[PDB]
Design a protein around this ligand. Structure first.
Ligand SMILES: Nc1nc(NC2CCCCC2)c2c[nH]nc2n1
Ligand code: NI
Length: 311
């Protein structure tokens, strides 16, 4: 009944945003461990759900093309002005990435070389809730298995939006849906394992202890270090997961999430060793990168991480 659109098939329902290739590369961003909700269903066409709506994104050299699926048995059309603002904010396109690239490049010869090939790696501005529970699922895991866990979780707990081909799209569940007495048992059936406990517990915690999703909005305006400590009170959320959320959902560009993977890069590519792995050592490494790259150190880190995935 409903199929995945392409730019050739139905170009009437698309709309463009002026966006250079050097500012954004969909294929280096959408499935590079930031969001787990985007899939290249057809070549160069990334479909995914964003704010209880489905999008398909494709780009050229200088233009970013996008179409929307409402899915309320209503008359189809192009993306509105407000829907384009949502996508503008999502990619944080007011921030020049070219100027940031050159800024980092001036004080880092290693970044200079990697920045040659891998342009247009930027940070998405995600919903806190979606980001929070996605990154709780990330512990001792990989992008492939995380993507599945998040998809199944949304199917079980989140509301249906639309079906395109054989892909049924669900929005991300609210906290109440994940806090229920059966939630852990269901999530274990879906294969999350121990992460099922942390998911339910954290949803339940934000509700009762922190007073619902407004708390996450408060953290978004709170200073980085205050937001980080508050997140670390949640079950299954430590320094690494907290930094991810800070960087990707709470607008803390200086947040540098450190795990064994970042240790590996830091050591191999910068020859870094702790002067003063461990919680203490991980914190020093985050300070190191902030000292080196400055207040958008988290954005620079994404370029390396994204570059490190692609051989
Ligand atoms: N799944 C996943 N994702 C990560 N995020 C990176 C890409 C986006 C910017 C921050 C780093 C991870 C970092 N360490 N382990 C990660 N796992
Ligand atoms: Ni060494």
């Amino acid at each position: 009944h409903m199929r995945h659109r392409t730019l050739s098939s139905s170009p009437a329902l698309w709309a463009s945003i002026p966006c250079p290739r050097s500012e954004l590369r969909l294929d280096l961003v959408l499935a590079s461990g930031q969001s787990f909700r985007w899939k290249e269903q057809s070549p160069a066409h990334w479909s995914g759900v964003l704010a209880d709506q489905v999008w398909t994104l494709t780009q050229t050299e200088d233009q970013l093309y996008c179409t929307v699926y409402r899915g309320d048995d209503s008359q189809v059309s192009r993306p509105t002005l407000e829907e384009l603002e949502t996508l503008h904010k999502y990619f944080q396109l007011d921030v020049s990435l070219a100027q940031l690239y050159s800024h980092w490049a001036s004080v880092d010869s290693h970044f200079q070389r990697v920045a040659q090939k891998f342009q247009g790696v930027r940070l998405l501005r995600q919903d806190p809730t979606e980001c929070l529970f996605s990154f709780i699922c990330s512990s001792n895991n990989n992008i492939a298995r995380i993507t599945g866990m998040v998809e199944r979780l949304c199917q079980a707990f989140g509301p249906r939006l639309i079906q395109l081909d054989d892909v049924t799209y669900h929005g991300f569940p609210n906290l109440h849906a994940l806090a229920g007495p059966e939630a852990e048992t269901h999530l274990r059936k879906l294969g999350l394992g121990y992460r099922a406990r942390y998911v339910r517990a954290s949803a339940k915690a934000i509700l009762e202890e922190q007073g619902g999703p407004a708390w996450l909005q408060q953290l978004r305006v709170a200073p980085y270090e205050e937001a980080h400590k508050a997140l670390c009170t949640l079950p299954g959320v430590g320094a690494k997961v907290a930094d991810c959320i800070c960087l990707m959902a709470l607008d803390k560009p200086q947040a540098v999430p450190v795990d064994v993977h970042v240790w590996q890069i830091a050591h191999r590519d910068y020859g870094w060793h702790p002067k003063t792995p461990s919680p203490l050592a991980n914190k020093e490494l985050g300070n190191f990168f902030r000292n080196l790259w400055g207040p958008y150190a988290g954005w620079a880190q994404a370029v390396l991480f994204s570059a490190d995935l692609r051989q």
